[PDB]
Design a protein around this ligand. Structure first.
Ligand SMILES: Cc1ccc(CNc2cccc(C(=O)O)c2)s1
Lengths: 170, 172
């Protein structure tokens, strides 16, 4: 299942692309650490691009997994799924219609990534129909031919929880 | 979704059912074991059954779930209502799948004739597979939504298209 790749990390979540590759949102990462998942920070490559961070481990941390396709966002009009895990034990896949890459003003801060709008729309008044701040690092995925593609990580949302930003690679 | 609603979702037959109150249990007709003569330690003779197609309601002559309060059961919901389908999956994983509800429909789904309130999943481009969509084992899971200040149950999961986003909620 895709869902066993979504992992609690720092102040949010991350996603196992492969046995050695983990992606997350830069702001959720601990600022004090000597190891992650039992490997010394000494042995980990860190590639940061604004709110997107990729970790490459020097041994197989998740040898139960196959490697997946990671791409720099997706075409406009693609309906992605954001794979949200909650501390409650809920799994909440939500449909997101994707638009252009932009630098957007979101609750008083500038965030660069792929814009999206949830298909739940109008509102939520309902934590099960929108994102909350704790959800940052959740992956954006879609099916293409036979394959799941991951195309970024949850970086920010407006107060409704219904306009979102997907941070992307490079 | 609140813990008091997940606590009402009970493994039953080939799927699930749902406690509306201490004495009322609803489910999808085809998940009921056809040989069964006893439910929650009560003989069939002491149970009132109300059945309409894929919707079945059991009413007991004593309190089976006294920890619960009675809640509101309605005959489906207004067109445009966004519901959550409360699906339990392998390992205390809880999957509240978001569905936009539409018209009362009759459909042919994988060859079987089904009737109830139709809806479209809001989980992805299409919901094929178990990560974004429903499976036969989910049948009898409740459709719920929050009003004003409270939660309503308006039916039970009866069927879904294999390659698609369309579900059917059986209704009272
Ligand atoms: C073999 C399949 C994999 C997934 C299927 C679609 N879901 C679904 C849910 C609930 C009842 C039904 C039904 O066809 O009764 C289908 S069908």
């Amino acid at each position: 299942t895709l869902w066993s790749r979504v992992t609690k990390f720092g102040s949010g979540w991350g996603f196992w692309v492969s046995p050695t590759v983990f992606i997350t949102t830069t702001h959720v990462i601990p600022t004090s650490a000597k190891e992650f998942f039992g490997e010394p920070l000494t042995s980990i490559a860190i590639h940061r691009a604004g709110e997107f961070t990729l970790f490459r481990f020097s041994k197989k941390i998740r040898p139960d997994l196959t490697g997946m396709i990671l791409e720099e966002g997706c075409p406009e009009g693609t309906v992605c799924s954001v794979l949200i895990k909650r501390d409650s034990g809920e799994l909440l896949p939500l449909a997101v219609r994707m638009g252009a890459i932009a630098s957007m003003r979101i609750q008083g801060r500038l965030v660069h990534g792929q814009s999206g709008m949830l298909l739940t729309g109008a509102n939520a008044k309902g934590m099960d129909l929108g994102t909350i701040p704790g959800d940052c690092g959740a992956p954006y995925v879609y099916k293409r031919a036979n394959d799941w593609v991951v195309c970024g990580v949850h970086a920010a949302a407006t107060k409704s929880g219904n306009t979102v930003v997907c941070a992307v690679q490079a």
